[model samples]
Target: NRIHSIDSGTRLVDVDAGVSLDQLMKAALPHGLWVPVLPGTRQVTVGGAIGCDIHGKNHHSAGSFGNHVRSMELLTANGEVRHLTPAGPDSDLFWATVGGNGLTGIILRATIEMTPTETAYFIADGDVTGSLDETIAFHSDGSEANYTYSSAWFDAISKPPKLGRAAISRGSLAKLDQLPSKLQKDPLKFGTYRNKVQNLTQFYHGFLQYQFVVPTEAVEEFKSIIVDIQRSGHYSFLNVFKLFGPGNQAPLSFPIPGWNVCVDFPIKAGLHEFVTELDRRVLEFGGRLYTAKDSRTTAETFHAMYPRIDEWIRIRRSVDPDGVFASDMARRLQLL
Candidate 1:
């Protein structure tokens, strides 16, 4: 069922840089495999993952996608078809290839090892704790304990009982035998479906209202409903609202290091103040947060978390001294 012209024992699958994660998932599923990690959006590409070493909700468990990659076929500065293996004569090339943000050259294909999963569903467990400290503690416990996925929410807007706090979310993979009776039909037998949700809706909404994106609320409001659902004795999940605030909250804002970032935050005037207020609370709480997505940060705060932009500049200049790769984002961020 392979697509390209290649010999068997190509144990590895080499995909074009432009191929979408959704396509890759479909292609690999028949082989009893899937991406080790996946972002919320399935439109990301192998090139993008390699450029950023993309991590998802299960980062604590699987590290990053790059961790699973065997090798990459880079179209480098010299424009050669070099096979960058993890360890060999071109170790630097390999490291540079992944997480290099495609600065080196156009990556035509990548030979990666797909991960295996028993089913397409996750056995999810969720909790809503109010406050960053509480959520952090809960997440820490979940970490050493045993859960495949975990995430949290920072409710920076709530006053005392719900301020500078967090809401915990966690989940795990469901065993194949544990799947619902209806899902027992082999996944391979499932029919192909399309997402009728229009892209124009997303673009217009995002452009006009900045996309009023809301992560669904905790599911515990209907306690009786949950109890009834659990009475079936099949669900091992929990969801609820956590309240924080009046209580000390952490600083809401910070910086992170990566080849790319996705930004989202309140677009009003109070954001800076609220985030700074949260930062003070975070410091008082004695903890730090990931910067994969940050609203607005100063250069001082930016360098403190990363401390590698200088090295990137050295390498970037070494490879792209002419700076033809600079984009509008690089200019706005003053990286240009």
Candidate 2:
């Protein structure tokens, strides 16, 4: 019962909360259907995706996972099963549960909308932008073109002339005819490419990371701040960026028609101070951190970023007065 039914005509599915993305795809792809919104990994559970309200490279076009959820079945503290939708009288509770991180109730199962595809491949094109200005320009231009997916990797450890330089990539889902001669024969193939390439033993672990989002208009200034930090000798090897579309009604959802950046810094002296400074800058520029990937943001900054917290709490309390559902994140951030 983990993997349930897929309605091919509407491209919607009824899946158990614990069903993984890989399981969902294996069942849907053969029928020319795809999950409308996906995160970086296929290992995440349907419930986990909704809990974090995950977003993907296509966020600039499709929004977050919560936006595609048609309706879900929730198990409340009172041992009642209720069906919820995105709008109407029960909308407040529904939206709250979407990004409430399981504090509202346990998601038993969900009926979500999926996308149809002509092929499983994408036609990706990209280039190396020499500076922060060039990189931002490329991202903005790509967004204007409405590329279905776009992302970039920047050289954060490099100095001055080379700092902020990035390899920007943009892709559109390839149509059956657009595939290469060889791939054209099996355009709908869903290969295990990632599993084959990812050798954990070859890479270093324990890197501290931060993922933050800022308004699109403030992208240039944010890049400047990043450059300044790099100039000060705080080096990080992994840095990437993605454009996000307008956010939904889910109070805690992170995407907001802006620029999302993720950087991984090796733990070192002054790392905390460096992050603290970045946190201040992000807040000043009117940005917020992603809770799923965050381990260090303060309560004050988090509250400032999420202005709808009070409303979410009110709705949450009304549904779960006994506080039967709770987690370390809720306690640390005082979400309850």
Candidate 3:
């Protein structure tokens, strides 16, 4: 059976490698549990999340999913029944499974920690900044003080004075007493859990805009919940749209240990110029981009995304020489 929810506390959280996070969130949310971090959409799967060690707007605080996992049941190429844990004798392989992108073994089931909250809702606040420097600085220096999670919106269309016009947002989960009146009215009730597979197959179609630009104005309008919520400095189910700029779509998403910068250089004549300039600057500043979130990343930038990619690769090959698990991203990033 294909599913994405965390399943019964005793029942196995079995899922195909293809399930999306959306499925996971819906199933888990009804249980007063939430994934600690969510990357944009809730349409990713437990397997994929572990594969990427997915990080969300809260990277500064929670790190990645890999850090929260407890254990998993993995299927090796040799058909071995193995329990992978972070501290067991097979710990090396366990580490590989989290962010190794499934190259080491196929995961059959996982026992992961579900982050519980007083309420499913969050209080959000946001501020518009004049430049990328201001936006990044606000989050970097103030993330811990004011928020448990934060994200920024960059102006992809302008240059110089407005090159990175951004809206910075932050938030904390809402307390039970702080929940909205309507939600409190239905205290024990919540929305119905949706069919995970149908949602993924029928709903994930829009994300196929990988090769082209998806409509941004509409996407932003839809994503404004988090932005709007942040601006209130209190738990909000909706986000505040404090800043308006150009395109807000991004796809390249490789994760690593550095300040993540997502640049949306115009795909027109000056793309190459903007890319080179920004890439060089981030390097100088000792920052890096999230590899999985990148779309037009070059070989040079690929290496830069994970300076230790080679280390991950070397260890990966040692475990799966036949390369049983592979993804288009691995090849594009030259991980193989």
By the lDDT metric, which is better: model 2 or model 3? 2
lDDT of model 3, residue 216? 22
Q: Residues 191-296, candidate 1, lDDT per residue (tens digit)?
A: 1112211111121111101011111122122222223323322222122222111110101112121111112342445455645543333323232333332324
Location of the lowest summed lDDT over 10 successive residues in candidate 3: 204-213
lDDT of model 1 at position 99 = 46
Q: For residues 21-68, write the lDDT of model 2, one tens digit per residue.
A: 767877888778877776556678898889889887788778889999
**What tens-digit string does per-residue lDDT give for candidate 3 at 209-269?**
1111112233332223223222323221212122111210111234433333333222345
Return the TM-score for each candidate structure.
0.65, 0.92, 0.67
**Cα deviation of 257, candidate 3, in Å:** 5.7
Q: What TM-score, to 2 decimals, does candidate 1 have?
A: 0.65
Q: In candidate 2, which residue pairs clash? A: none
- Best lDDT goes to which candidate? 2
TM-score of model number 3: 0.67
Q: Rank the candidates by lDDT, best first.
A: 2, 3, 1
Model 3 C-alpha RMSD vs. true structure (Å) is 10.7
Tell me the TM-score of model 2: 0.92
Off by over 4 Å in 2: 142-144, 191-205
